[model samples]
Structure formats: structure tokens, C-alpha cells
Target chain A: KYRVRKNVLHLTDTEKRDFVRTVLILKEKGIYDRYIAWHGAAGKFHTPPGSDRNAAHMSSAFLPWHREYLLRFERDLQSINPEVTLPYWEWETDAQMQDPSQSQIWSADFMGGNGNPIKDFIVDTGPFAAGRWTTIDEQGNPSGGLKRNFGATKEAPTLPTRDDVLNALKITQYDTPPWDMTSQNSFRNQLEGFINGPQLHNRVHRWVGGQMGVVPTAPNDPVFFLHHANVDRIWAVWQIIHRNQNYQPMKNGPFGQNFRDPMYPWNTTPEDVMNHRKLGYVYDIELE
Target chain B: KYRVRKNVLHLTDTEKRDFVRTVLILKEKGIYDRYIAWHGAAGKFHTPPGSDRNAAHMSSAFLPWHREYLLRFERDLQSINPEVTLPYWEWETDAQMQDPSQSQIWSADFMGGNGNPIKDFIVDTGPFAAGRWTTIDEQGNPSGGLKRNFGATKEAPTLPTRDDVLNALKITQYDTPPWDMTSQNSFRNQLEGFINGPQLHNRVHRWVGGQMGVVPTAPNDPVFFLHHANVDRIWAVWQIIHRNQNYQPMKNGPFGQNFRDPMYPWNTTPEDVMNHRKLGYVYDIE
Candidate 1:
């Protein structure tokens, strides 16, 4: 891979600043809003209308859909600053901390700290503070501020741990029949954190609370991408260990959930993004 | 232009059936829902956040945005049946009827009849009737049957007449600053129907009621495309009559309201779709 995507802790101070600056420029130029709208649209667009399987989530296309989304976002970032690559948050390592909120990723210089309780849970200490960064409602109107409540929910009191990540890597099948949130032995449903209710990916969303707590409004928070990067990294690890396994629902699944079906809001299909390295970027641990 | 989009009245029974069938197939194959979602997304994506201007409506990009929308939709229809083309709903002429709802377009053989009051304004007849067709809400979830209450609202008691259509065509400027709904004497705003507060396009929407009455949910009904085709046709006529007039706010407008700015949900721009004929399609009148 020509580009190496490192963990957030591994990024130098210059790297972190450049990434933030590029994203701000994108927001100013009106390009970043497109991503927010695109994700929102896909979430609503059920694979076969009325079904629970949407183009982006609760389906086999989840991994590849976000893979393509991040790929496109990374390319856009590179267009603004050629040196900046997307970095993962590695929440499993952060979970080791006595107070995971103290991780450097939440520092004011990076993503900013938790939401201020007095200010209605509005984020107030980071580059994406209430006054500095703008957010949009599910309806797409300007919602005024980014907000986070860092594990305030009863369902998700802490981030997913190392064992959770390792356990998901042990899954051999990319996905299983009834290809949705309930699929068993499904690496997708496992890593997506829907098992036993809000295990990993879904737990992180609830743990963050505020805008990141729900599917439709999740992308309003910049950390949504970083959080997903770790999810994507876990899928990459699973792929390496299960070399014989492949994406499920090869045929007869929902239109967008099938192996070759085009994901909604974009034409990129799962098969198109199944190989991340072929996409010209690799997670840092892949080289190690 | 190789493709000739016809008037709804001129289409033969077989032509109408084919077009309806193609749309049903698109819906069945999961392609039709994309259009509905795309329109909803663009409607909420303000040209500049916190402003009234949007990529699809209430701004200078209104005409060209729908032009590109219809163009892409027609291409999708053609993909299903190359002989099928989008037909414009001539509501101006239909407005002349004693009861515009009884016009041939509302026949059970076509788009079905006006919404039945006892049935909660849900259309009980025709190809896209309640049981036969499906619809989605602003949230993208299944919202059940297609519903319509023709001319039910007091503000839009009737459709815009032929004179109303002519009056919009008389405007010389494409659009004027601040290039939104309140833009005075701007053809974009007049045809968009915010001029007298829902006069033409806006009135047509309210007159139809049900899903068509709202911006986000309008595309749920199949008629939204036909209505927009006529709107697009009107703009094409204006382009012909005022050959020298160019799209306004050519520069120094909001990011998406500008001539060259990309429309939300798609890369096509006003400049990209400025010439209707160049996009390989023409109205039957042209």
C-alpha cells in the first residue's frame, strides 16, 4: 500500500494539526456537508424499502460501504493536504486507562474533551467545540453544535476492550444467513457490535452519546470517521486470519446486501472494496 | 436532441402503460427509491448552511437542479424500456376543466383518481393506488399508500391557469439577488411559485395535497416527476424565448447557488445543464 493509516496515538503533533486543518477547509468549501448528507440518505434508504436492512447499516454492505466512504473521504482530505491520512482511535487500548476519557485523542488539541453538562452537553473544549464546529440535524438543518457525553449511557459504560476485538477476529465467516444484525457466527454482526445488544461498534456510538448516539445523526461528529476506522481495522484483521472466508450473501440476498449489488447513495459495491490494500491504503499494524 | 419528452395527453394508452410499467420495475429492482432519497437529501442541504437557499429548491439552482434530476430519471426509465420517455403533465390546460380532478390524467387507467375522503384521501384506483404502490416518509421509512386530495387546500383551491404560465415566461431575468424565493421579477422564483406565495409550482404542489404538498415527501407520489417535467419544460420554453439572457448570480453567489457549483447529491451543475437540448433531450413542443 502506498499510504499507511496509523493509529491516532502514533500521529505526530504536525500530522494531527494538518488533518484538522484540512477537514476545516473542506467544511468551509461546502464539500464536507455532502458526506453528512450522503450517509444520512443511505441510512434511511432501506435495501428494499420497508426492510430493516439499509444501504449502509444492519446489512452485509456495512464494512465495504464505510470502507468506500472513508476511502473517498481520505482522498478528499489528500486533495486539501497531500500528506494527511486518516487515523484510527484504537479505543481498545484507551479502554485500558483508569479514565478512558483522558486518552490523548480527547485532548483539546485533537478532538476536544467531553461535552459540558452546564451547556446542555455541547462540546466546549476542542477544535470542534460548540462555537467552532457546526452540526446538522437528521433533517439536515444546521443544529448549532457538536455534543458528546463520553460513556454516560447505562448500556455502554466503557469502550469495547481488547478481548472484544480479539474475539471478533476469531470469527471465520464474513457474514451469515438472515444477513442482518442478528446473524450468528457473523464477523460483520460481531464487529458491528450488535450481538448481546450494543457490544462494539454500536456500543461506542451509545458510549459517546449526543449526536454519535444514533445512526442518522452520527456523522455530525468528526470522530465518527475515526471510530469507524478502528471498526474497519478489526475487519481487516479478521480478513487476514480467515483467508478462506469471503463476504456473505453472494446471491439471493437483498439488492444492496448481495456481493455485487451497488450500495445506495453510491455505486461502489462490496466486492469493489473487499480488498483494502488494493485500494492503496493499509492500517499500520498490517505492515507489522 | 434524440429523446423527445411528450405531453401526458399526447401519449397513447400503450405508451402510458409502458412508462408506468418501467417505473414499477425500477421500484421492484430497488432503483426507484434512490431518486426519492436523493431529492429528500438535496431539499434539506442548504446552499449555505443556515440560509433559506437549498441545492434543489428556493434558489437560483431550482430550475437546473430539477432539469438534471428529470434528465437522470428519464435515462433510468430508458434503461428499462428504450422506447419509454418522461411525459410532462399539462396542468395549465387541465385547469380549464370544471373539475380538474376528472381530467383524463386522473382516470383509473392512468395515475388513478383523486384521494377518497372516507379513505383518508388515499387514492383507491389506478396503477399507483394504495395497495399497488408504496411510499416513503421524510425519514425514509415506509409511509404506506399514495394519497392525494386534489385542490383541497383553500390557499391552492385551483391549479394555475394558462395565463399564469404565460406570465412567468414573460420575466426577462433568469434570477436576481439575493437569488432566492423573494427575488423580484426573477423567472426562477416566479416559476418556482414563491412569487405570490405558491402561485405556479408551489400552488401545484399544495393543490395536489397529500405527499406532494411537502417538499421532502413530494417524490413519494409518481406525479412529482410529471409535475417537475412540466416545470422543466416551462424553463426550456423560457430559455428559447430569451436566448440572450443567462443564468443569474453567474459568480459571487453561495457555494451551490452559483452557475458552476455542483448540485448537492450529484456533481451536475447549472452550467452543466444550462442547455436542455445539449443533454440529449427535448420537449415534444420544441
Candidate 2:
């Protein structure tokens, strides 16, 4: 079995710049162009082309497709710089409904618009609301904008300030001190809730392209992987806290019942996902 | 990251049998005795301590704990047999109601008293009807006789033959077939439904333990690693099929809602499980 020599990568400013440059170069070179283009062009959400309106959308197919695409990209990066593995940035941690003026990475029209595209953070706001922003009108009306403006948004909601969400979840500090002990547990528990719980989980999608109505370009769209890596990191941390135990099985209820729905992107069912030992790999993280 | 290297021992039957024997010996040493004993003593189901009306009971907590326990056992076996790594038997393939009776390494009682615990061939006449022996009372009432003994009268309505299941699912052969196909795509797509489809997935669990039951503890019990190995194999196969897609995000779900949930014996979540690249290991199966 393979094990990670290092848990986290603390990149220097130069390293960060190099990493970004490499990523941009890859994007420009169209390394990820093939996979994304294939899905965008040939992917199906409903009965090939014509079907129920709800069924006609992209479905969850994009999520897994992008994930695999990014993994290939990461592999390419590793091939180039074996010492520097991809480091995810969990934007939610630094989430603050940004001052539309801030020049942060997620600033205005991350899809290249002046404002965020998404509307209602909850409920099925339709394809226009589900991150396919170009489909919507400037007045925030549902237009299903052209593909070119796919991720274009209106005033994007400022992500919860790091303190706002963390405080709400009760995380006072970061992983260690300056960060309070209770707050740390609070952050950890909230993160677990965010992964497993329903409302908050849905809210996360709402906060992202789902509500903003912009299709996420890559699984590592900075937002996707960072959020996921934190979730993964939380599980890594949870493993030590609880000792190693398999996750609960998908049962016939709201929590896990939809595992078999064809709309679900994973080619494997929830049951298949249950057995990690059978999966031929296990996670090894730097224990805190 | 560690890549798989084929070990010479895995190919040799003698080496494999020796490893199995080591696991059996360790079980005999009562390594898991403490945990099993604890469950049997304190873990009670419906009725009470001693009652004929009592139901067959096992521990849910036991499976994962035992999985970890057995991994340690595998570690020990590896120490002794340097060339051998623990091989898992994906019993889901063969363990159906229609398969022929075969001798299993593990005890029937631990595997819920089914025929050949590893294959999980279950007779759905209710509980403990693994199609092996006749369940007869002192007077030999009709209710308690085996299918061989009682004939058609003993068979249940929904008793599915192995072929019955395979035909329904359109599965032409078992997952680990005797013959191999030259094309990787053909081989990968051939068994997708059997491994991930709902009917077989649900039935395999029941055939092994009927319903919510504990992990069986038979030494030659194929159910343990066989089922798991197949499960692991499916994931590997999926990577080839879908490339490297992660779990789909729920439209209105949570932040990590797209990832699968990690609840028990395995201490990882969908998020943790998603990236095979992040994981440092891969399987070694020819």
C-alpha cells in the first residue's frame, strides 16, 4: 500500500506563483480541454436530447466527469514536479460575502462577469440557478444564457466571513491555537455536518454555482477541491479521533436512499462505495 | 505512491493455503475472542437471555472492528509468508441460492448457519435455510424438514436459483470468470451491473446473512475478503470505465454532499474515498 510522506504542503510565495503559472499554462495548452469539451459537447442528462425538462439538464454527470478530468491534470503536474502534489484551498474557510471591490480569486464574475449569477441559495432554481449562469438575464431572470457566459454571474453573494460561518458552527480558531479548543471541535464537527448533514450540504451547493447559476469548470476549480480536501482532511482527523471504522451503509431514507438513482454520477452504487478494503486502497494522513 | 508488484507467492496454492492456515490459527488463538465474547455476552436483540422464541442475533459493530482485526492478522501472515499478500474472495459472484453445495472453511453458525458461508447461497425459507441440511424436529414435522428431505414442500416461493438471478441481471458469467477477454473495455463493462446493480447488491447481503447480520467468522469463509476483494476490484475497474470521476454533488445538498458518507469499519468518507490519486496504493491482481 502507498502512504503519503507529507500530510500538507506549505508552499512558499515563489512556489505558489510557479504552481499557478503551471496551472494556467496547462489550461491554455488545453490539457483539460479534451475532457471538459467532451462532456460539454457529448454529455447527456436526459433521454439523449429530448426528455422531461428536469431530466434534460446536465444531471450530476458533470461532477464525476470533472473530478476524473482534474485527477488526470494533477497526475500531469505530479509528472512535472513529483515533489509538489496539488494543494487544495478551502474557500469556505475564508468565506466572506466578498466586498465586490476585493480582488480576491473568487471576485466578480469568477466566470468573468461583474456580479455573481446565482439567486435563491436554496431550492431548485432551475438550470439557470444551478450554476449555468449565462442562461439567466441581467435582471436575474431565467434565460438559460449562452454557453460563452456559462459561469458569468451578477453580484455574487459574499461567502460567509471566516468568522461568520466558523462562529455559527462555533469554530473560534484555525486548527491550532490562537484558535480556541472548543472552536476547533466546533469547526471539525460542523465540517462533518456539512459533509453528512442535509440542509448545510445543500446550502454549500447553493453558495457555489448551484445558487449562483454558474457551471464549475474543474473539480479543482480551487473551490471544489479545497472544499473537498477540507472535508477529506476532516475525515482524516475524525479517523484518529474515532479510531478506524467504516462509514454507515446507505439505507432506504433521505440520508442515503438516492444512491441508486441513475442521475447520481458515480458509476458505482453507494453499496459498492461502502467497502474501502475491497476498493484496494486506504487513506493515510499526517495525524495531528 | 506505491505501485503494485506481482509477488511470486500469490500465484502458488501452497503459499495461499499456508496464509489461510495462519489466519485460522490466529483465530483459534482467540485474538478476536475478547470482542466476540463481549458481543455474545452483552449484545442482546429482541427477546431476552435464554428463550426458544429468541431470534438469531449478531453484532453490527463487530464487522468493521473484525475487519481491522483481520487486517492485523493479515499483517502477521505477511510477516510469515513474505511473498504472500492477503487475497480477498468476492463471494458475491458464486454465493446464490442455486449453487452446488461445497465445503466451506468457516463454520455455518458464524456465517449465520448458511450453506458454505463464503458463497452465501441462501434458501429464503426464512432464517437459516442455506440449502445444506434438513431442519427436522424430533417428530419430523413438515415445517422443519430440508428441501432434499421434504422436496417441493420445503421450498419457499421466492427461492432464487443462481441462474435465475444471473439471467434476470443479464450476467453471462461470474465476475472472476475462468476465461479472460482480451479487450479491457469488454471485460470492464461485462460485470458492471452485477457489481453495482441494486438487485444483486441487495440479494448478496441477504444470501450471506439473510438480513442485518454480523460479518461471518468462518476460516475458509469466502464472504470476508472474497466479497470485499470483488468490491475493491469493482472500484479499480470503475476507474478504467469512467476514467476517474468522483461522487456527484447533490444539487441542493451540503458542501461535501457530492461525496459518499463514511460510517463504520472503514474510517474514510466519500470525500476521502473519491481521489485514488491521493491514495498512495493500488491493487496487484492479474
Candidate 3:
């Protein structure tokens, strides 16, 4: 039977428990470390760089590459527990955090909250902060616990709202040449959060600085999946909105960067796997 | 002798003319286009890529390379008119414009205002807008006129003020790796307008929104230098404040993309341009 990805906000309590339990199990199996370690090393996750031949980001491939990474992780989780699937956090829900330190998502029931002040922002309040899960910091130093700095004062005032997402969809092109952060009017750039200040994705990283903010071990924070689940969901919904345009840069272009290029280690291009149905999973919401 | 570059607002008519006349001289020569084209590619101008051998930006070298570019342009101008030097726009002053289109700089006397609406924003005003000086559109398409959209509704509401510049100066770090526009807290990122939704440099580009708004060839508009001069001056002032901590990815880094890497065709490093005085130029007010 096919699996499904759902929203954490709507997940029944037992479903949440199942999701968390499998992640803990996955973490124990040593299956996830390399996926994150590669971010710091700038290597492709499923297989290290030079193995599957991944594309470098600060380019247009940002979206598809990450989608492949998430798909592989989800498939592995589904393998571990047929009932286990990823649940997304729709971030604008958390953007309401005036006193983000106390947001419910930080409660021990879900992810966890801030670290004790003066001890650095090690996650002290959540399940991941149970002191069993381990991860690295910006400089790649390892620690016994996870970290998060949700609703950072220095972050952009708030997450993009429903209207903001609509505005992003208004962006016409998929991407332009030098399809990295500079592409204007490209939905990919807007979603990647680099164009004209981060519209969605990158802003969340800055909003939650400690580990999630660090480019290297960001996935160490379990919330990484939830955040990206939403990003993935948004991409799914956006493609439907602009179905007139087919897909992102795939492998095998002039500079070896194209909308149809293969995502390394996975042997699939963004075009190959963009249709969620191909992976046997689908988002519950359209977002349009 | 060290050349003194003054604020455009402060320049007397004659000093301004010396600056303008020399710019026209440099603009005619192969000298002017290299300064901007080095940062971003727009193949149409007198100075195209491959001349300066400047790599495309998105590297850590954005700030200092621009400093060197400004220095060379100023020196060339100085040779043409001994009193000629780059002038500063002091952007926050223009930020005060209720309708920046009405600002004096857009007059026949200054950088012209917005292009005629529905006519592709082609400036039908100032000398540059007179359709004589040619440049590329935002997409690098060739056109016979300059473009400007003062007080664009889609831009940051106001320009960086004195406090804003000081706030940027307070960042203390020069830049982080992956240094393009995403380098948070890096002065280069903030000034480049990639951080936090366009601060100074990128904000001005967004606010201007024509050829100037284009990421690559704002220099074709002629106002690009004045805006960058203020940015250059701020980088100078910032160095004075944080003399101790030092800046980004310190030494002996990989990929040969550090603050000290030699900028192509120019034979200088960011460390070399770090000091304006060493480059034989100083801000008049400083």
C-alpha cells in the first residue's frame, strides 16, 4: 500500500508519537547523520559527493536537490515503520510567536523549546532535547543534545502570510540563468528564499538560528523535517498552480545544470521525480 | 597626492562639472564600464566582460573589488580634471523625498527622474536620459536611453539613514562564506542588498527600479557611482570602528576565494583596497 504525508497540526496524538518514535529509531540506526553532515561538507546526502555527482546550490537546483533528499529520507522512514510518514509544520503558524520561546511546538509533547539561557540555545524543553539525540553546531562541534533559536529577535519581523504565498505564486518563470539566488520573478528563487530577501524558506532558517539556522547541521533539529515538509508541500501546490510550466533544471545541461538534470546518488532528475505520485505519496492540502 | 572625493550634495557647481566632464571623458573611454561590469554581466556597454577578467559576483570579493573599481575610476577622472573625483549621494537625504521623482537629482540638472510610464520607463529628461547615452535594459537588452524609477512603490519604504549606516557598521564581520547576498550580518551582504530584504546598496537599486534597479548594470545610469561612493565611505568608516576583531574566513582558506585573493586583471586584493588612503583616495569629509 502507498504511504501518505500529513500536516503535524492535524496529526492525531498517536500519529505524532509514531512519527517521533520512528525518527528516534532512525536516529539510533545512524541512518540520518550523513544526510546532515553532507550539508556542512557541501556533499550530496544519500551518497557523498563524487559518488552520485550532485549539483552545487547558490544555483537553481536548490529545490529539486532538497526534494530528493527528503524523498529518500521519507522512503527510509516508511521502510522502518510502514505507518510512519513525514508531517509538515506550516511555519506561518509559528510566525505568530510574539513570545516564541513559549510556543506549543516547543513543548515536550512535540519538538521542544529553547535552551537554558547563558548555556547557549541547546534545546532544553522538547523530546529532541531529551539529551539523547546528538548534533553539531555552526563550527561542526558535536553535542549530546539538539539546539534551536525559534522566533529570534534579529529575524525578519514575521513569516510570509497566506497573501505572501499568493504573491510568491504570482512570480511567472520557474528560474532564469545563474538560477541561484539572483533570479528575479522566478517562483523557485522566491520559494528558495533568496530573491529580494528570503520570501519563505531561508527566512525560517534565520528565524530559528541555533542549529536550524546553521547551514551545516540544520537537519539535526528534528523540526527540520517538519519545516521542509511544508516547503515540499508548497512546491507541490505551486507546480499545480503553474502547471503550464513543466519542471525545474534537471541534470545534463551545458554547464551540467539544467531543469531536467539527474539528482545525484538518486539517479533521478527534478523532472523525473517532481510528480509526487511517482514516489507513492501525496500532500493532503493544495495550498492554492 | 591623495585625491579627495566629496559628497555630490556638497560639491559646488564647478567641482560638480569637473566631476561630470571627467566622467563623460572616462565614459567615452574603455575605463568606466569595467568598474560595474566586473561585478555583474551586461554585455552591451563600452566596457564588456573579459577585458577586466572580473569573475561574476556571488563571491566574497564583492565589497573590496568594488572599492578598487571606484578607486580606478576616480584616478582616471582625476587625470582628466585634477579637481575631478567621485561624488557621494548620501542616499538617506534622498530617502527624505516625499516623491523622489521630484527630487533635484532627477531634474535636468541632476540624474533624471523615472522613465516615461508605458514607454518602457525610458528617461526622456536629463542629459543621460536625452537618448544619446546608450545602455542595456534590466535583462541586458540594448536600448538608447537611461532608466530610473524614483520612489518605487515596491521598494523598501525608506533609505538607510545615518543610524542605518551605523547599524550596518556595527555588524563587525566583513562577510561569511557562501558570501553572495545571503551572508547574514556580513557588511558586504547587507550593503549588497541580499541580506534582510535589501538594506543600502540593493535597496537603492530596488528603489530606483530601472536600469539602476537591474542587478548588473545600474552603473550605466551614471548615478551608480554616487550611490556606491557613499557605500565605499561607509566601509571605510566601519573599518575604523572595528579595528580589532578583523574579518571573515581569516587566512589560508580553500578555493582561493578569501578577502586577500588577487582580483583579476587589476593585480590587487581586497586587503589592498581595504584602505582608501593606500589607494591614493580619501573622502572629502573624512
Task: Give TM-scores for every candidate, taking all chains together and pairing residue i with residue i.
Answer: 0.95, 0.31, 0.47
Name the best candidate (by lDDT).
Answer: 1
lDDT of 1 by residue, A149-197 (tens): 9999889999999999999898888999899888999999998888997
Model 3 C-alpha lDDT per residue in residues A71-169, reported as the tens digit of each score: 878877887998888888877666655664465566677786776656677767656874667764433345556766655655554665666667777
The CA lDDT at A220 in model 1 is 84
Q: List the pairs of residues colliding in candidate 1.
A: none
Name model 3 segments beyond 4 Å from true.
A43-56, A96-103, A137-141, A153-157, A248-256, A286-288, B1-286
lDDT of 2: 0.32
For candidate 3, the per-residue lDDT at A151 reads 55
The lDDT values for all models are: 0.89, 0.32, 0.64
Tens digits of lDDT, candidate 2, B1-286: 2533222223355644555455455434323222222222122211111221111112111222233333444455555555545454334333442531231322232122343233443333322344422221111111221112101122221223344333433422222211122112222224322232222323334344422223222222323444444444454445554554433322222211223422121223345544333443345653
How many pairs in model 3 have backbone atoms within 3 A of each other, for residues 3 or more apart or on separate chains, i.e. clashes? 14
lDDT of 1 by residue, B174-268 (tens): 99999888899899999999987879999999999999988899988888999999999999899887975879889898888889888888878
Query: What number of clashing residue pairs does each candidate have, in the order they appear?
Result: 0, 61, 14
Q: After superposition, how far is residue B151 of candidate 1 from its true place, in Å?
A: 1.5
